[PDB]
Design a protein around this ligand. Structure first.
Ligand SMILES: [Cl-]
Length: 163
């Protein structure tokens, strides 16, 4: 029986937008917001099974920017009051014989200056010898980063939304 392990990588950035508005727009309204403002990034998001809570299975189809590829996510948890959203990658290019699943956690933390700290944890569920490239991981972190800036810009330009 092959070695089962977990490789954990955590990363953070800041936003001028405080957690309640950021969690409502960027996290809870991702399916509707991102295809609408960034069609090149996301073509659409479709719920396959569930209502939007824990256990929900959803397929995200990318735009031209990611060669109309796609990812399938399972929602592992949602804590609206603490701004925590957990989900697993259950179908995607990042999975292999070596990486069977990636569980992510996005947590919004408030700061005293009125902003947010966006804390992203990636947990890679490994099988056998572990061979994880820093370039492969950091391209995934850059990806999430440049997209967030499009969301942040839009929310600043449309202050009446997600209040
Ligand atoms: Cl990238």
């Amino acid at each position: 029986g092959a070695m089962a392990g977990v490789f954990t990588y955590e990363t953070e950035f800041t936003s001028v937008i405080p957690p309640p508005r950021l969690f409502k727009a960027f996290i809870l309204d991702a399916d509707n917001l991102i295809p609408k403002i960034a069609p090149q990034a996301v073509k659409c998001a479709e719920i396959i099974e569930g209502r939007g809570g824990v256990g929900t299975i959803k397929k995200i189809t990318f735009g031209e920017g990611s060669q109309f590829g796609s990812v399938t996510h399972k929602i592992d948890g949602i804590d609206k009051e603490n701004f925590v959203y957990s989900y697993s990658l259950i179908e995607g290019d990042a999975l292999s014989d070596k990486i069977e699943k990636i569980s992510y956690e996005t947590k919004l933390v408030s700061s005293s200056d009125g902003g947010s700290i966006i804390k992203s944890t990636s947990n890679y569920h490994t099988k056998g010898d572990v061979e994880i490239k820093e370039e492969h991981v950091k391209a995934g972190k850059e990806k999430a980063s440049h997209l967030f800036k499009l969301v942040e810009g839009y929310l600043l330009a449309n202050p009446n939304e997600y209040c």
